[PDB]
Amino acid sequence: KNIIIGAMTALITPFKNGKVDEQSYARLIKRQIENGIDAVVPVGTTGESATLTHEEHRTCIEIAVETCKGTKVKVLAGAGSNATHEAVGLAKFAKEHGADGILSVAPYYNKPTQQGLYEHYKAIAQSVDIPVLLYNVPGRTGCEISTDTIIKLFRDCENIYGVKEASGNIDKCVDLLAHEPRMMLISGEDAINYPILSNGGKGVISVTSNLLPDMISALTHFALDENYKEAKKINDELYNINKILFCESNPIPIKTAMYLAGLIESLEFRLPLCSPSKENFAKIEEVMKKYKIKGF
Amino acid sequence: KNIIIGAMTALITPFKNGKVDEQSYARLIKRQIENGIDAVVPVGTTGESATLTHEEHRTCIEIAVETCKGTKVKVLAGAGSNATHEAVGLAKFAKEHGADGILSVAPYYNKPTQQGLYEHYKAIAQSVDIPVLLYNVPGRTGCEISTDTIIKLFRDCENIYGVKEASGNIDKCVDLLAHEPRMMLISGEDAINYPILSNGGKGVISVTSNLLPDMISALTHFALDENYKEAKKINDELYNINKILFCESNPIPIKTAMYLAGLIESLEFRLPLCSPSKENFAKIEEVMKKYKIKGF
Amino acid sequence: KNIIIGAMTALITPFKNGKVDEQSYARLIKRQIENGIDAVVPVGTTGESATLTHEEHRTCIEIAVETCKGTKVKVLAGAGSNATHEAVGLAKFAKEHGADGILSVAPYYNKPTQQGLYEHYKAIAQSVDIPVLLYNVPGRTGCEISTDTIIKLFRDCENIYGVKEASGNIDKCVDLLAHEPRMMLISGEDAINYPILSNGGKGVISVTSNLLPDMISALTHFALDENYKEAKKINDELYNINKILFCESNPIPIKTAMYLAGLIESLEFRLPLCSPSKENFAKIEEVMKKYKIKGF
Amino acid sequence: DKNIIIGAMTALITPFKNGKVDEQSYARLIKRQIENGIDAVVPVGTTGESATLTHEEHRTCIEIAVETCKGTKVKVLAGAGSNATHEAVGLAKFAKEHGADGILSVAPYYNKPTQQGLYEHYKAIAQSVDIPVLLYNVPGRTGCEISTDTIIKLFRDCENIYGVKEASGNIDKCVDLLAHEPRMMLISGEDAINYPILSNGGKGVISVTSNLLPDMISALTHFALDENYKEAKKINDELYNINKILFCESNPIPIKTAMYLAGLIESLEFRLPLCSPSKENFAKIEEVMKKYKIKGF
Ligand SMILES: N[C@@H](CCCC[NH3+])C(=O)O
Ligand SMILES: N[C@@H](CCCC[NH3+])C(=O)O
Ligand SMILES: N[C@@H](CCCC[NH3+])C(=O)O
Numbered sequence A, B, C: 001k002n003i004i005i006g007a008m009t010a011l012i013t014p015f016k017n018g019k020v021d022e023q024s025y026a027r028l029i030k031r032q033i034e035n036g037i038d039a040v041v042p043v044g045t046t047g048e049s050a051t052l053t054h055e056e057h058r059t060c061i062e063i064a065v066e067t068c069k070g071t072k073v074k075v076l077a078g079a080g081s082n083a084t085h086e087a088v089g090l091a092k093f094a095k096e097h098g099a100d101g102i103l104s105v106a107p108y109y110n111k112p113t114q115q116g117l118y119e120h121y122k123a124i125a126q127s128v129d130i131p132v133l134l135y136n137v138p139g140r141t142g143c144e145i146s147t148d149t150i151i152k153l154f155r156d157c158e159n160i161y162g163v164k165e166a167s168g169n170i171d172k173c174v175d176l177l178a179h180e181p182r183m184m185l186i187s188g189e190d191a192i193n194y195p196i197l198s199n200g201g202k203g204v205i206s207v208t209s210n211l212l213p214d215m216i217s218a219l220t221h222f223a224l225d226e227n228y229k230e231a232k233k234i235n236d237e238l239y240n241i242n243k244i245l246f247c248e249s250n251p252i253p254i255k256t257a258m259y260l261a262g263l264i265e266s267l268e269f270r271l272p273l274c275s276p277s278k279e280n281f282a283k284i285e286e287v288m289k290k291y292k293i294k295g296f
Numbered sequence D: 001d002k003n004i005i006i007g008a009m010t011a012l013i014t015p016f017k018n019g020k021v022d023e024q025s026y027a028r029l030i031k032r033q034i035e036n037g038i039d040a041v042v043p044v045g046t047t048g049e050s051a052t053l054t055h056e057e058h059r060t061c062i063e064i065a066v067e068t069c070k071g072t073k074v075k076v077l078a079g080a081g082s083n084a085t086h087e088a089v090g091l092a093k094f095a096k097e098h099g100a101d102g103i104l105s106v107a108p109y110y111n112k113p114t115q116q117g118l119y120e121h122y123k124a125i126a127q128s129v130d131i132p133v134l135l136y137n138v139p140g141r142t143g144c145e146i147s148t149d150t151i152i153k154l155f156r157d158c159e160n161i162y163g164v165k166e167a168s169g170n171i172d173k174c175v176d177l178l179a180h181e182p183r184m185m186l187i188s189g190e191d192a193i194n195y196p197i198l199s200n201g202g203k204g205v206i207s208v209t210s211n212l213l214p215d216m217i218s219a220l221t222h223f224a225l226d227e228n229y230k231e232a233k234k235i236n237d238e239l240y241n242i243n244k245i246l247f248c249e250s251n252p253i254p255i256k257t258a259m260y261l262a263g264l265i266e267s268l269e270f271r272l273p274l275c276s277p278s279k280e281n282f283a284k285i286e287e288v289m290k291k292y293k294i295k296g297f
């Protein structure tokens, strides 16, 4: 019943001259380790999994795996895809190269049925013997992993242990944990980190933690120790940055914040992702000032 | 800032031969008082505020005040309307007839602007000197009281002390209490009662409490005493009843349950409200059996 | 099946000193008569049906019926309400006082089921012997009259002859007219007047016609005579005014336009409706200069 | 000024046999469309399961499409979309170099970029090739919407962007588009509302129903383009029930089921996460089909 919980980070993927900055990628992973982060998620939605080639996707799981060798920090590698043969491929690469588990996003664009989602995830789970965390973000995929399908996959496949929820649907998180209380519900939405943890959630996969890993790690651990008045206190402080980090489509605002804080050298994206508007740029710079950003 | 918080019930309005049954109305109020309920909300959305004549709206506030005289139970009278001159009339009647405060639903159908909503509520509050609780349910009104508008009304009109949220948006309730922590956030959605209380909410205006007032009252008091593990446990047990009470439009499922429990004489509505479907009738009867329904 | 179709206007209700300007009302309906309008709709959503008293609602049907006598222009009186006893009351007043038919909006706020909508409209239909036109606006009522419910009411009720659609759902209007081609589909959305008429719709109940009755009247008859390129050309010229007349909630922009054109003396609303933002005021005045506004 | 590909078009299904592309049924399904009045074929779209095909299989079905439409008036508007711009430019350049008459490019999915990103995304695609490029907006599946302003700006700034295949169920947006930019080719991507889009100035459809009933879809489009809206609307009303039942589940699950039930494909095979429909929906597809007479090969 292997799980990966606690404070986790959906790592941004820095670019340098149109190639992956492998130097800076490892240097951002050591900033997360030294600020209380329990696990890192390479190549998620925040890692621009869509514009990376299969070798770049694979190269940044390997960099993640060795950058956390000799630490407690686990690697929950992003291995999702809208094609099952593609998702199994990323899952098999992650196991054979030392990953502690995989995050697998619901298939996007092709909108599979609930029966399709079941067989999609069942094929991935049986491909490996490492933990598998589901990932539901219907605003991005066009499809919903129903509560019944999540619970069925948790009960029918032995390495499927929970779901990364990014739904803004607190009703579904009461639904999930009331009918299946043994599952690990992970928040994928920074604004509601504390409410999800306060209802029995056991971790977060955060975007803000790229910028403020100490604050996000403190929030999760306070909540897991049932210290809910301090957990809510950090969640209230983080609301302004949590919402302005979505003024444009993630990960455009967070990479802007990392550039403004000097944590990445160049504000580079891969198309169709671009730098934000000049107005929103000013709004990112203004919200950052109310927080104390840790350096290297 | 005079407040009305705690476990509250949006009481159903029983009909007999298409006229308001005034004697069963009072007998449901000693069932609520006698099971730990802290306040009652006469003629809300659950009370069919839209289908009562102006005298029946007023007569059911009078019964609530009279039946709660000599007790600790307050009366937060429903006084909302989509016409401001109509809302001021009900608000001043509520004070002049002994109500401790008023609930005021956002104007429906006429979809006012944020400036209109500000002036709408600014006009009501200035009519009375008793607490005024806002009520935001955009799924039924077609308009939403913005987070800024709620906070502005809370800060500018002294008797306006909080809001009954039934938006199903936990992000908005972090938004409200992180920027204005002195406001009384009231849950208007039974399925997510505990998460709203766990984030600093100070009460509920419940539909489920019509049938199980002791459980809903226990949930709120557990949470207000910061016993979040027992509050969540009741919230998880109540999920099935909380959602099956909305398989059809409120208050059709709850009135069906009250009739099945022998607490009201007739499964009677006034059009356009009708008895539920044949199928949903069976679903209410089936979910009720897993709960212990307290009598008179 | 007696019908009321063609180019129709949802009349604005002018106020002076917080009262209904009854003589500016009659002179505004006669501006509509002399510009090709086939029927007038007193006290619709554009007429602020929500803030008028029940006697003021009745007074503006009387003015509408009286002004149209001796004309070929029909009066489709607004008689909808979220309470069936209120809608039947208005329906019987319209028949007994000379209206040619009634418009009845879907019940708002209390969200009846499809079974409730059937009994609601059937009770209204058996109330009178004049044509009854349904009115579907889900953005404001929170409920929708399904295609199946509309078709049943058309087939089961003699005087029920069609539906005013304001959903922005051209799929539903293909659904309606492909399965029941004998019904009169009326456009309730000015921007898509021509597409709805081009698919077999037989009229519009317009907001823009308050300001530009000649263009809406020309558009409808061009389309009804199957002159689709001239109907489409007028619909294309009117797009800019059709959409900016909803930059704020109707009838706030249209009353602003009527005031700017000197067709009403005071830009007065009844709360919670208010005058528009100062920006939208400037942008309405800006779009208006591209059209030739007919006087009295 | 602009080169376009309009008329009655078909979003081709991709038949599978034992987990690979049945290349001989693919060519025989495009050869069924040609003789039934279809003006162009769209290989490997959303209906073609572009997401589960390898890049080498995606390219193989553009090649089959180009060869099968040689000697005929039937054009190839090849599916070349991707959520990665370098991937979309790759598919765009392959299509030109291999004989396609144009490319369809879906709005980037999942990464949901901003309007500025969509502009630069499509400008890179348009400048990679010199053949027409048709935009494709389906927000229900991609999570993003190409605003009216971005479509119009892309139409005016780049030669080969000549229109958009709309699948939004938003007739307001199609009045917005053609009232402010009437020189663009608006293509319906939603079979139920083919006629309303054509009646407002649309100049073609990229159809799913045409996979099963190409003659009816072809007659509908040409009736509408000849401004005979009473026969065009009559066919659109006749086609509504099948137009709706082909989406009881997510496309292309119902359409491939219908093709299998009609004996036009041999195996009801998908690539995961796409699967066979429920037995319940299976029965509802079978029953709506009988009220129509399906042409064979
Ligand atoms: N077009 C694929 C490429 C994924 C490659 C691995 N990250 C997608 O965006 O899903
Ligand atoms: N149908 C009326 C009822 C008013 C009288 C009691 N609230 C309304 O919704 O405003
Ligand atoms: N506020 C009431 C007024 C109804 C009187 C008739 N216009 C309602 O909208 O239901």
Ligand SMILES: N[C@@H](CCCC[NH3+])C(=O)O
Pocket: A081, A082, A083, A086, A109, D050, D051, D052, D053, D054, D055, D058, D081, D082, D083
């Ligand atoms: N799964 C990939 C497939 C790309 C190859 C064909 N488009 C995607 O959706 O982008």
